[PDB]
Amino acid sequence: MDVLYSLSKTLKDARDKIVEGTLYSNVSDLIQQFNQMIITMNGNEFQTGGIGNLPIRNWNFDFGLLGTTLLNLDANYVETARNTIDYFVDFVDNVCMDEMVRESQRNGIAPQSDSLRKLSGIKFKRINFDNSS
Amino acid sequence: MDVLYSLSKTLKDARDKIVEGTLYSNVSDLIQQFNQMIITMNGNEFQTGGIGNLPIRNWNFDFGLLGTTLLNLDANYVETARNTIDYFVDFVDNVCMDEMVRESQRNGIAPQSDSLRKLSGIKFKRINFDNSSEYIENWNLQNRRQRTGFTFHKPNIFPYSASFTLNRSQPAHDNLMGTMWLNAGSEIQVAGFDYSCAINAPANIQQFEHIVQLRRVLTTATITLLPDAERFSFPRVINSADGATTWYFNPVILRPNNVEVEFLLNGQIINTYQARFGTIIARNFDTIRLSFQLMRPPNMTPAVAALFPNAQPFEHHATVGLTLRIESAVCESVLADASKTMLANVTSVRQEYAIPVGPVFPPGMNWTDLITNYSPSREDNLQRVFTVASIRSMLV
Amino acid sequence: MDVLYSLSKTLKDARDKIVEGTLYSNVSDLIQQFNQMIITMNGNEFQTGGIGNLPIRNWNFDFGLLGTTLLNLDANYVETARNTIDYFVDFVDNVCMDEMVRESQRNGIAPQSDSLRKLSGIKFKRINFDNSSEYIENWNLQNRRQRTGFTFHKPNIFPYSASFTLNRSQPAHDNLMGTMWLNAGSEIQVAGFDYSCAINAPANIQQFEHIVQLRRVLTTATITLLPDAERFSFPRVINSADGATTWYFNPVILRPNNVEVEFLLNGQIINTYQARFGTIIARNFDTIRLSFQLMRPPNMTPAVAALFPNAQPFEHHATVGLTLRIESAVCESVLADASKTMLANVTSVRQEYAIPVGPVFPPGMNWTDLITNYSPSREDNLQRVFTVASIRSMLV
Amino acid sequence: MDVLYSLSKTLKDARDKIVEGTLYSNVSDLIQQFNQMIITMNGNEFQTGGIGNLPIRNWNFDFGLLGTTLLNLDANYVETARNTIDYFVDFVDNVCMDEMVRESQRNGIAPQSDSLRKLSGIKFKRINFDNSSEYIENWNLQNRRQRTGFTFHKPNIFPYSASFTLNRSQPAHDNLMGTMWLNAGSEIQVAGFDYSCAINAPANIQQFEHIVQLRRVLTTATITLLPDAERFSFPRVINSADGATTWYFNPVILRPNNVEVEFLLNGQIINTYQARFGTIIARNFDTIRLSFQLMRPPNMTPAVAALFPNAQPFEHHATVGLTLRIESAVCESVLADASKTMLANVTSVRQEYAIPVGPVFPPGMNWTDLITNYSPSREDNLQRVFTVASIRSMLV
Amino acid sequence: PAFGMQRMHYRNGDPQTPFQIAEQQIQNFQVANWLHFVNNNQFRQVVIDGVLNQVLNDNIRNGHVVNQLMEALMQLSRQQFPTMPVDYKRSIQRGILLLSNRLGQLVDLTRLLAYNYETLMACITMNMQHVQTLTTEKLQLTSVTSLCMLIGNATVIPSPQTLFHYYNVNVNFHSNYNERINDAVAIITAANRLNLYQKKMKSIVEDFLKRLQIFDISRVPDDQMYRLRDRLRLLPVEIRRLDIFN
Ligand SMILES: [Cl-]
Ligand SMILES: [Zn+2]
Ligand SMILES: [Zn+2]
Ligand SMILES: [Zn+2]
Ligand SMILES: [Zn+2]
């Protein structure tokens, strides 16, 4: 849950902060968090399930890191970031939907969908950051 | 818009964060953003306000920067910052007011005032940073034509409408069958009245219908549905449909029967609730169809039997009611609502400066007329001025 | 879309420019664009789908580049280029067909076919070049939320409707007052008939009003307005509103009186033409109000005075008319018109391969049903399929 | 005009071609042309507006060139180009609107707005490049004293006129011989009616003639000629010529006899069509002469023989007709037509900004009044504003 | 020349520097953004512990802005140089890349320079007033080339004893300056209050300047000597000296 929340929070921050013309000092920590997310997610396969009419979806992560070395973000940077962000947002939305439609009588606080159970592994704990909501 | 929002956000962050005693590492990025704003604005002349009674104001920027190597901010530092902050807040407020009082039929989403047009230049794009507010986020997503929605607590989606329809009528208005409804804000109160209590209706059941077509699609909406309409449950004297004569309504409330709510989108049944009261969820709809029925109680106690005779005169009129309150919803377009101040802010600015009526909005920013005729051009202009009003309320 | 359009545009340029004897300098830039397309497409597998009766087709690209060695193109060069172009045209036409026969309710503007989804990947952006067509220009402007413009000669904006309203009627249908209209395509023919010739009207004037709501806003519209309505000026036997009986209409045409044509936007008056006939301009409107009057002639010659008695029976029913043709207009949404072939191409492709009815379009691609219920989802899907149809018609 | 068109054409090419991913070789010449535009416009101040409600707008041009080297265009390149293009497109739109709202009796072809007069200076001639549109091409050909040609689908060459002439008449208006016609746009319906059915006409034939003088010569004109006139073939209560009384018309349509359509130039017969219907070609003419005869049927059936008595009263009036529709023609002068929007654009711009009536055009740019008195000064001003409107349409 | 632009006909006395004009006239984002930084990388003023300090933009202190420079000059290495003879173009681009490919060393050098500046500036006690001086220190750009092409990764910071010595010399100079000001003011005010109208305050000012130890008094212009007298007259007398005088 905290990992899914951190993925979503990183993506929302990236959508709000990685904008054309902005100073790199506005996004440095966000860029580091985003790259940590990409590194942790790269190489992992996910399947969002086919409960009900929810389509079965498969997700593969092989993305380049967001660049440093710009004083101000330009349009090329925003375009690359937007491609990656759009894919990640689609994945996180599908994971959230797949979790939202499941339930168990006992241990109902624990994750139910396969993707969120996978994301509960230790290897993804690196993604986790500010849990402020 | 992004640049104006970034200016306002920088000024708000400067007010909140550039405070006495704070670690410089708390403010380093903000100080950099603030200095970039100063640098970008220095040497630029702006003119705001040549419309209505909004006075002509000229803005020049020759401000110094803020230091970058002390460890803790002191009172000297805050004093150095505050005068610049005040001038910039005044400028941003005037730019927002200048934009709010302007409209265009062709490109209402595009900037209208001179200052916001100059701020659309590429050189000012360096000021742009974290666009995290709901309105600016929706602005950026809508510019990209991505799916994005505004979240409203009690959206004012229904134009004010207190009307009635008579299915059975005659000049004396003593045996009337029909419906009366109030549509206001996020509330629908509807009531079907039968004066004969469906005495001669087939199966002693009288069906009432009410259709409300929303001007914009609502999604993920929470609805409270209660089985009475307190607005149409007391004696009333009501004008005739042409205003020639007044008729009398003397309700006695019976519980509505076969209560059905159909939330529809493009004429398709999306959500259906039968005999369900309290909280219901309508995921995606543009039309609300309420079907209800007055059923004669087959068994009546002597008082109840006296209320409803077999034939005229009918003095106690059998009424069934429904109340529908949209507590919260999501709409891809902007709307007035009970929580926000955007509409009120824009109206206040327009009234305080005697803005002449333009070709987009109704006079006085009347919401009933605006939501009755919520055209795409009106939606564009309204999103622009509401985003500007949200940017202004960040500082004022 | 931009990539698919660029592919088709490159193929069309190659077909028109790679001809025997032509200077290489005539084609150098085209050859570079074509070779870039070859490089980008090489090694990519595509499948055009099997919806309906469209055959499943697989596409593999392993083509060599076009040569750069000739000063003038010879026949061998043209033949090699023709072979490669033929394969690419087959692929683009199949992709366009696979896109046209698909629709979506959630995101109907987004690509639906798998190949167009693959072509939206960044790797294919190198193919993209000159987007000069009206439909691709509108597509790109819409993607940026800019003011779009589609120019239509005789836009098919009115759904077919041949109806009448009787404001005064009786079961024998001999003293009838009302209107009959045909709304078809770009044409409106309306006619107000009074059987008593306004003998007992308050000032010997019978007012008729016709309100036509356009499903989309039209701008820069050239409109021919003519006094008579030739369609409602001959004897007719007309079904009753419930189809129970048939009534008789024996028109005699008088000159319409106080002809007032209003073009309204958001219920506000934009254009007004009083007693004006011929060509008029409606700059921006979404509603047409035609108000006309049957005025009893104050003076009549004996034959005229004989046509119109003082009381029933009435044999010659005084009819006034109006005809309103939209010759040209501009709309922000796509529409069928009398010149463009987008709708016909989409319909022909859907019928040729027996595409099952989907959740967006009416079950024949029938235009009356589509324009009657022109929802935003329908508009999105229609813009997509019309853009793809234009891209296809560049090659096929 | 050539310079303004070159600005607009450069901007349109830049919009269509400077796109993400495209090869630099696709745009190299365009990039040079765009840079030349920037160089020529730099350091110049322009003012537009200040007439009617058109706002005053100042334009200052200080833009850099595009010098970046790339194999393919990226987002940075496109965004820089887009900023420059947006400013230039706004400027060109304002210059076009400023020129479209102005007129002069003397030298109405010459530029009227200050910005366009400044753009006519020699220093701006460097901007000039490809002039390929019909309107600018005709402008250049005319400036060269070369024969120009505007092609029109359904030219609006006939001013609206629904009139009649009575050759035999009396106060009772019961024994009338004459003609009635509608000349509207590209259509001419004419009908000769004899109430006696040529009972006493020499040889039992009544000859009708109708001369329509075109305000400008038409060439290469495709005409559809149909025997009957559906507009004058139903019962009609028509007004008196002076308006004192009304007369009655009860047509029974006979096929026109000895039909002769003569297309004349300077009173000489260029084309003649005798008993020919359907598509005909009038190659060059300024006048149309329609001559048609009502020939009393020598042999009638009893139902026919009963409609035409020997003497008055005459109840069924023998009407012959003709319909003449110019589907396409070529005129040396500019005209409204069914497919184009230049007139509509000019009228819309004048109405939206409340342009006061000037000394050249009629109020509201009414096409009937304009084309009835199509004077050389009016023609010059109209060609100017139509060329400007075509230039504006390329961008707006 | 890289972007094919017409050479700048710059005019002396223009309120804009050549780089300020170029920033507006150049459309490439790498070069324009680096130019924008250069156009605005002036000292910021801040008072720390009652001492005015000239401090740097944080992007200099962390060295991040060198990346932007790298970006700009990488763009310059890709440019066509339209009319330039190709051997000269190759040489220019390869020299650009010589600086470009030392990005890590240049970031390290910028950080080292900024850290040394800040640490040594901590030891300054008199306000760092920025004025354009009559004479300058001549800096060879070849020495800049040496520093940029030869710096390694060996960090060198001021020694603590070096910092203490620098601070002590600054404090001694500041204290002596104040004490000589006080002595001069006390003597001038005493001479005036004692009605010593033949006393020449010029000798007092000369003694004060000589005791400041860093002035060759023979090369002090007369107008500045008299201005110094005038400013010394306006100052109040230090409490201990004034009490002794009373
Ligand atoms: Cl509440
Ligand atoms: Zn509340
Ligand atoms: Zn009533
Ligand atoms: Zn009927
Ligand atoms: Zn007459």
Dihedrals phi, psi of A126, to nearest 5 degrees: -65, -30
Burial (CB count within 10 angstroms: exposed 0-12, middle 13-18, buried 19+), residue C337:
buried
Stated as kind and residue range, the H or E segment containing B379 is helix B376-393
CA distance B387 to E145: 51
Stated as kind and residue range, the H or E segment containing B160 is strand B158-168
Q: How many residues does chain E have?
A: 246
Label residue E81 left, alpha or beta by phi (over 0 means left) and psi (-120 to 50 means alpha).
left
CA distance D355 to D348: 10
Label residue E195 left, alpha or beta by phi (over 0 means left) and psi (-120 to 50 means alpha).
left
Q: How open is the CA angle D155-D158-D163, to the nearest 5 degrees?
A: 150
User: What tokens appear for C244 in the block?
Assistant: 């129970």
**Cis peptide leading into D313, omega within 30 of 0?**
yes
Strand partners, D330: D151, D219
Q: How far is CA B172 from the centre of its chain?
A: 41
Q: What is the DSSP letter of D298?
A: S
Report how far apart, in Å, the C-alpha atoms of E22 and of each of B199, C135, D64, D85, E141 are. 90, 39, 9, 20, 22
Report how far apart, in Å, the C-alpha atoms of E166 and of each of C287, E61, E211 are. 85, 22, 20
Report how far apart, in Å, the C-alpha atoms of B276 and of each of B230, B260, B318 are. 18, 8, 22
Max CA separation in chain A (angstroms): 53
CA distance A86 to A92: 10
CA distance B126 to A20: 8
C-alpha torsion sign, points C223, C226, C232, C235:
negative
Chains touching B, CB cut-off 8 Å, 3+ pairs: A, C, D, E
Q: Which residue has the tokens 């819409």?
A: C142
Nearest ligand by distance to the CA of D174: 5
CA distance C312 to C334: 51
Interface test with C, best of D22, D164, D189, D343 (most C CBs within 10 A): D22
Q: Which residue has the tokens 């006034």?
A: C320
CA distance D43 to D60: 7
Nearest C-alpha in B relative to E39: B39
Reduced to 3 states, what is the DSSP secondary structure of residue A104?
Answer: coil
Q: How open is the CA angle D340-D346-D350, to the nearest 5 degrees?
A: 155
Contacts with A95 (C-beta within 8 Å, 6 or more apart), sequence order: A4, A46, A48, A113, A115, A116, A119
What would the DSSP string read from start to end of C176-239? -EEEEEEEEETEEEEEEEETTTTTTSTTSEEEEEEEEEEEEEEEEEEEEEES--GGGSS-EEEE
CA distance A38 to A62: 8
- Contact, A80 vs A66, CB < 8 A? yes
Distance from CA of B181 to the nearest CA of C (A): 24
Query: What type of residue sits at position C388?
Result: V
Dihedrals phi, psi of E79, to nearest 5 degrees: -75, 155
User: Of E184, E220, E179, which Cα lies nearest the Cα of E199?
Assistant: E184
| Structure-derived torsion over alpha carbons of residues E93, E97, E99, E102, reported in degrees to the nearest 10 | 180
What would the DSSP string read from start to end of D143-207? HTT----EEEESB--EEEEEEEEEEE--TT--S-EEEEEEEEETEEEEEEEETTTTSSSGGGEEE
Stated as kind and residue range, the H or E segment containing D270 is strand D268-274
**Helical segments of chain A, H only:** 2-17, 28-41, 75-100, 114-119
C-alpha torsion sign, points C82, C84, C89, C90:
positive
Reduced to 3 states, what is the DSSP secondary structure of residue A83?
Answer: helix
Query: What type of residue sits at position D199?
Result: I
Q: Which of E24, E44, E61 sits opposite B65 (nearest CB)?
A: E44
- In chain E the first and final C-alpha atoms are separated, in Å, by 75
User: What tokens appear for A78 in the block?
Assistant: 């925003």
CA distance D206 to B92: 83
User: What tokens appear for B164 in the block?
Assistant: 């009635």
Nearest ligand by distance to the CA of C168: 4
- Contact, D215 vs D379, CB < 8 A? no
User: What tokens appear for C241 in the block?
Assistant: 């509103």
Interface test with D, best of A76, A77, A82, A83 (most D CBs within 10 A): A76
Reduced to 3 states, what is the DSSP secondary structure of residue D259?
Answer: strand
User: Of D104, D51, D12, D112, which Cα lies nearest the Cα of D349?
Assistant: D51
Contacts with E155 (C-beta within 8 Å, 6 or more apart), sequence order: E112
**Cis peptide leading into B313, omega within 30 of 0?**
yes
Contacts with B198 (C-beta within 8 Å, 6 or more apart), sequence order: B204, B205, B206, B294, B295, B296, B318
SS3 content of chain A, % helix, strand, coil (to 5): 55, 10, 40
User: What tokens appear for E155 in the block?
Assistant: 């960090």
Pairing between strand D187-194 and D317-331?
antiparallel
Stated as kind and residue range, the H or E segment containing B349 is helix B342-352
Pairing between strand C251-254 and D236-239?
parallel
- In chain A the first and final C-alpha atoms are separated, in Å, by 13
Report how far apart, in Å, the C-alpha atoms of C370 and of each of C357, C365, C373, D55, D132 are. 13, 7, 6, 41, 38
Stated as kind and residue range, the H or E segment containing E145 is helix E141-150
Dihedrals phi, psi of B265, to nearest 5 degrees: -135, 120
**Cis peptide leading into C302, omega within 30 of 0?**
no
Is there a contact between D65 and E5 if contact means CB atoms under 8 Å apart? yes
Report how far apart, in Å, the C-alpha atoms of E157 and of each of A34, E148, E206 are. 34, 18, 40
Q: Which residue has the tokens 């753009």?
A: D119
CA distance B100 to B388: 7
- Contact, A17 vs B130, CB < 8 A? yes
Nearest ligand by distance to the CA of B165: 3
Q: How many CA atoms lie within 13 A of E104 on its CB side?
A: 3
CA distance D43 to A56: 61
Contacts with D190 (C-beta within 8 Å, 6 or more apart), sequence order: D179, D180, D181, D182, D208, D210, D229, D232, D290, D292, D321, D322, D324
Question: Is D173 known as a binding-site position?
Answer: no
CA distance D232 to D326: 19
Question: Is B317 known as a binding-site position?
Answer: no
- Contact, B343 vs B386, CB < 8 A? yes
Q: How many CB atoms lie within 10 A of CB D110?
A: 14
Report how far apart, in Å, the C-alpha atoms of D187 and of each of C225, D223, D325, D327, E161 are. 13, 10, 4, 9, 104
- Contact, C8 vs C93, CB < 8 A? no
Label residue D220 left, alpha or beta by phi (over 0 means left) and psi (-120 to 50 means alpha).
left
Q: Which of A25, A70, A74 sits opposite E67 (nearest CB)?
A: A70
> Å resolution of this model?
2.4
What would the DSSP string read from start to end of E83-113? TS-HHHHHHHHHHHHHHHTTHHHHHHHHHHH
Q: Which of E2, E27, E79 sits opposite D66 (nearest CB)?
A: E27
Nearest C-alpha in A relative to E37: A71
Is there a contact between A71 and E67 if contact means CB atoms under 8 Å apart? yes
Distance from CA of E48 to the nearest CA of B (A): 7
- Contact, C14 vs C81, CB < 8 A? yes
Q: How far is CA D298 from the centre of its chain?
A: 45
Report how far apart, in Å, the C-alpha atoms of A40 and of each of B384, D34, D352 are. 40, 46, 59
CA distance A77 to D74: 10
User: What tokens appear for D15 in the block?
Assistant: 């919009």
User: Of B361, B363, B373, B393, which Cα lies nearest the Cα of B108?
Assistant: B361
Neighbours of ion ligand 4 (CB under 5 A): C 240
Stated as kind and residue range, the H or E segment containing C349 is helix C342-352
User: What tokens appear for E46 in the block?
Assistant: 């801040």
Distance from CA of B116 to the nearest CA of D (A): 14
CA distance C380 to C366: 17
User: What tokens appear for D17 in the block?
Assistant: 């071609």
Reduced to 3 states, what is the DSSP secondary structure of residue D287?
Answer: strand
- D133-169 burial: b if 16+ Cβ within 10 Å, else e: bebbebbeebeeeeebebebbbbbbbbbebebebeeb
Reduced to 3 states, what is the DSSP secondary structure of residue E176?
Answer: helix
CA distance C348 to E93: 59
User: What tokens appear for D73 in the block?
Assistant: 């265009």
Q: How many CA atoms lie within 13 A of B251 on its CB side?
A: 24
C-alpha torsion sign, points B218, B222, B225, B226:
negative
Report how far apart, in Å, the C-alpha atoms of E170 and of each of C130, C227, E167 are. 68, 101, 5
Dihedrals phi, psi of C352, to nearest 5 degrees: -60, -35
User: What tokens appear for B95 in the block?
Assistant: 């730019």
A 25-84 residues with CB < 8 A to D: 74-76, 78-79
What's the Rg (C-alpha) of chain E? 26
CA distance E225 to E219: 10
Nearest ligand by distance to the CA of C304: 5
Q: What is the DSSP letter of B242?
A: T
Reduced to 3 states, what is the DSSP secondary structure of residue B260?
Answer: strand
E41 contact B CB<8A: no
Q: How many CA atoms lie within 13 A of C199 on its CB side?
A: 16
Contacts with C252 (C-beta within 8 Å, 6 or more apart), sequence order: C307, C316, C317, C318, C319, D234, D235, D236, D237
Max CA separation in chain B (angstroms): 93
User: Of C168, C236, C149, which Cα lies nearest the Cα of C207?
Assistant: C168
Q: How open is the CA angle D229-D230-D234, to the nearest 5 degrees?
A: 115
User: What tokens appear for B45 in the block?
Assistant: 């002349």
Burial (CB count within 10 angstroms: exposed 0-12, middle 13-18, buried 19+), residue D73:
buried
Burial (CB count within 10 angstroms: exposed 0-12, middle 13-18, buried 19+), residue E47:
middle
Q: How many CB atoms lie within 10 A of CB D387?
A: 26
Report how far apart, in Å, the C-alpha atoms of E95 and of each of E36, E83, E101 are. 23, 19, 10
- Contact, C287 vs C221, CB < 8 A? no
Max CA separation in chain D (angstroms): 94
- Contact, B375 vs B362, CB < 8 A? no
Dihedrals phi, psi of D66, to nearest 5 degrees: -95, 105
CA distance D143 to D134: 14
Interface test with A, best of E67, E69, E74, E101 (most A CBs within 10 A): E67
Tell me how far the alpha carbon of residue D173 lies from the centroid of ligand 5, in angstroms.
6
Q: What is the DSSP letter of D261?
A: E
What was the experiment behind these coordinates? cryo-EM
- D365-374 burial: b if 16+ Cβ within 10 Å, else e: bbbbbbbeeb
Burial (CB count within 10 angstroms: exposed 0-12, middle 13-18, buried 19+), residue B269:
exposed
CA distance D331 to D220: 9
Residues on chain B touching C286 (C-beta within 8 angstroms): 375
Contacts with D211 (C-beta within 8 Å, 6 or more apart), sequence order: D287, D288, D289
Query: What type of residue sits at position A77?
Result: Y
Query: What type of residue sits at position E105?
Result: Q
